[PDB]
Amino acid sequence: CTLKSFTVEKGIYQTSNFRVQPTESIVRFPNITNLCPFGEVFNATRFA
């Protein structure tokens, strides 16, 4: 695949990275409780 041919002669060859490996996913977040007050801005009775 690396040399893109169906024939290969003698000699050492260097290969790229082609092996396919599955991988899981992990996420780490800090503690947080309160909610963001976006509605208060969106529910403002008057805009400056």
Binding site: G11, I12, Q14, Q21, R28, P30
Partner: protein, 134 residues
């Protein structure tokens, strides 16, 4: 915390100061991180093993092959290449039992003989390879 990366993690022993949260490399990429919840330090390491060289005697004669793993000691070749995470055809060359240790790393797929002929297919560090007698 939004830092997105891809690699194995390991428990670290770096001496972070209390106000630090990252760790950088000579090339200025993320290398060490701190867990947001508990105060521990992790070292990352990428997963590809840029590496293996392939030795063939020429497809017009035989399809057999040998593999040289560069600069890696073959007590830990299954670990460093993640042999158990790959197709069994790769596990065949990972396991071996035709395992030779050379200054350039470790060679799998050939047998070592005391008598020394000329050089046919160069390898390095004074070692050559060839295809013969079946």
């Amino acid at each position: 915390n939004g830092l997105t990366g891809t690699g194995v993690l390991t428990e670290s022993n770096k001496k972070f100061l209390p106000f630090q949260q990252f760790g950088r490399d000579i090339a200025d990429t993320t290398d060490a991180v701190r867990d947001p919840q508990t105060l521990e330090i992790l070292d990352i390491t990428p997963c590809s093993f840029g590496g293996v060289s392939v030795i063939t005697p020429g497809t017009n004669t035989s399809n057999q092959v040998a593999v040289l793993y560069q600069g890696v000691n073959c007590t830990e070749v299954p670990v460093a290449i993640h042999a158990d995470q790959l197709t069994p055809t790769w596990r065949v060359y990972s396991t071996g039992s035709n395992v030779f240790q050379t200054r350039a790393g470790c060679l799998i797929g050939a047998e070592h003989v005391n008598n020394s002929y000329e050089c046919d297919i160069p390898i390095g560090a004074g070692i050559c390879a060839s295809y013969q007698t079946s």
